[PDB]
DNA sequence: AGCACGCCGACT
DNA sequence: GTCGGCGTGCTC
């Protein structure tokens, strides 16, 4: 008989072999019910052949075959298989992550009638306090008066079906089945909204994409906000939609502004399906089949929407391609942008990466000749060198602050991220604590009695006096969630303070990250970036870029939305070249410079990076386990000169809570060479018996 | 991951 | 004398 290698939803980097009951034909990509020691669990058959590696007598059989045809097209299958090894995640978790939950649970991949609880119209007219002390029946009807509740979703909510049942008894609610709907849109597909009123460059862009709309093509569409990136998306979609092919457009988690959705639903008289994290499992399933069956012209979604099955997909476009939201950071740590062009190239399709602030790596491939580029077309910097600081603010700015709160306006003050790792700086002369081993910046660690370089793990006592000018007023950098509110309120009394990370009125809102493109602040007239020092002297080589991204966003947003609001910058080094080139020459010029020196130090995107992080409860066991794997990695047959593994080094968040976090960084000029290096070294991880008593994670191409 | 087996505190 | 803590280990 034949050997069924089936992948299982367990964190084990390998398939499991079983036998077919002869007469059973399951191609790879089908779900099979299969015994797994003590449980009965589902698996995708990764491959069926006629040669195993263990006694065929021991090998249990497969219980049942749940799919006649694979639930993956060959393109998305190949794509998942490649990503499983490039990212080094257990193939079973990768394959399952890519399916609707109901398909991970072995239910049939066909349409099923959806049952919903709805409020009767007495249920929407009877006074809600009429049953005020009826426990949850009340809050159940509350939720009902905002929309239909699915039966199986009730379990996730605070109330139970008992309440809904008691309501149905009292005539307030009722259950029913929303029968599906068939739609043939390809016949009689027009466009509402308007006819296009494009200008010259948008026209040229649509032409360039159209003249290649069939072969693989990667287009970076670069244009600042309001230059009509979306427009040329909808013209591109139109052309692709005329053929009868389908379109997939991806946005950030917080990029689903009903503004953007309502615009798409108007332009086409074809079905659009939009996937936001708030849909239940039945809505996610049916959308999966509607897309695959062709009954859906357009799918709009986020990171996960990349794995959507398409009868005939014609184009895929991702907005705000620079957004970090496209890199999952729990579990399987894939990057939807990179996997997107892979799915685009393997489908022979145009991919459109639209951005107002393009990622440095995509700019790097544009230059390298792998994407083509399609283009569309006050302030004050305040030197803090010596000025007395009032809770971290500069006098020349606090006075320019009150003048803005004077007219009952609002103000955003932007700091570095929560948990930023701080440098050391001389308040008077600008000298920064550098490492005596590499020309890297030292990370200060006040409670630990020492400095510590994150690139070479050196240590030095905290120097009490500046070794270039001699001021005793040596300060850290970055303020973040240190409750600037506490030091701030005494100076701005009766003025409230809040945060904008997840009406009118004069106030100060601190910020730690970039704003959402569909998230404006109407009452804000003043924005100041206090994060320039932390950005420019960080242990994170990407801090500058993220800053320069935030700067060009808040400079164009507040600067020319229609009011003349001001941006102020607070650096101990206004003379800095990268800082100035950004300020007076724009993001693209800064980018070209930042790219050109990422190369001199040999970091992404010129090199490839891989972070292995492990944490423990004693600070002694995780590091040395990494030190062993470090030594084993270097002993790989494919190691040569270019591979470097710095570490082990404590993570930039040393002890989040009680556990202690250490990490090891691998880098190499060749992405797949390094993929082969760790891929081989990973099959022999059982050599180190401690790899199963630390919590270890593997992060390919990290964002940090 | 599940779900074992496997040796030491508070309870009938 | 129990019923139960989760510390290592396996699952074709
Ligand atoms: Zn100094
Ligand atoms: Zn160093």
From TrEMBL:
Single annotated GO MF: DNA binding
Swiss-Prot/TrEMBL keywords: ATP-binding, DNA replication, DNA-binding, Helicase, Hydrolase, Isomerase, Metal-binding, Nucleotide-binding, Primosome, Zinc
Domain called Helicase ATP-binding: residue spans: 210-376
BP GO terms, sorted: DNA recombination; DNA replication initiation; DNA replication, synthesis of primer; double-strand break repair
UniProt cross-references to InterPro entries, sorted A to Z: DEAD/DEAH_box_helicase_dom (IPR011545), Helicase_ATP-bd (IPR014001), Helicase_C-like (IPR001650), P-loop_NTPase (IPR027417), PriA (IPR005259), PriA_3primeBD (IPR041222), PriA_3primeBD_sf (IPR042115), PriA_C (IPR041236)
Pfam families reported in the protein's UniProt record: DEAD, Helicase_C, PriA_3primeBD, PriA_C, WHD_PriA, Zn_ribbon_PriA
Record-listed Zn(2+) 2 binding positions: 435, 438, 453, 456
Cofactor note: Binds 2 zinc ions per subunit.
Annotated Helicase C-terminal domain residues: 461-611
Catalytic activity line of the entry: Couples ATP hydrolysis with the unwinding of duplex DNA by translocating in the 3'-5' direction; ATP + H2O = ADP + phosphate + H(+)
Co-factor(s): Zn(2+)
One Gene Ontology CC term in the entry: primosome complex
SUPFAM superfamilies: P-loop containing nucleoside triphosphate hydrolases
Gene3D superfamilies: P-loop containing nucleotide triphosphate hydrolases, PriA, 3(prime) DNA-binding domain
Xref: CDD domains: DEXHc_priA, SF2_C_priA
Enzyme Commission no: 5.6.2.4
Quaternary structure note: Component of the replication restart primosome.
HAMAP family for the chain: PriA
Family: Belongs to the helicase family. PriA subfamily.
Function per UniProt: Initiates the restart of stalled replication forks, which reloads the replicative helicase on sites other than the origin of replication. Recognizes and binds to abandoned replication forks and remodels them to uncover a helicase loading site. Promotes assembly of the primosome at these replication forks.
NCBIfam families registered for this protein in UniProt: priA, PRK05580.1-1, PRK05580.1-4
Name the record gives this protein: Replication restart protein PriA
Primary gene name: priA
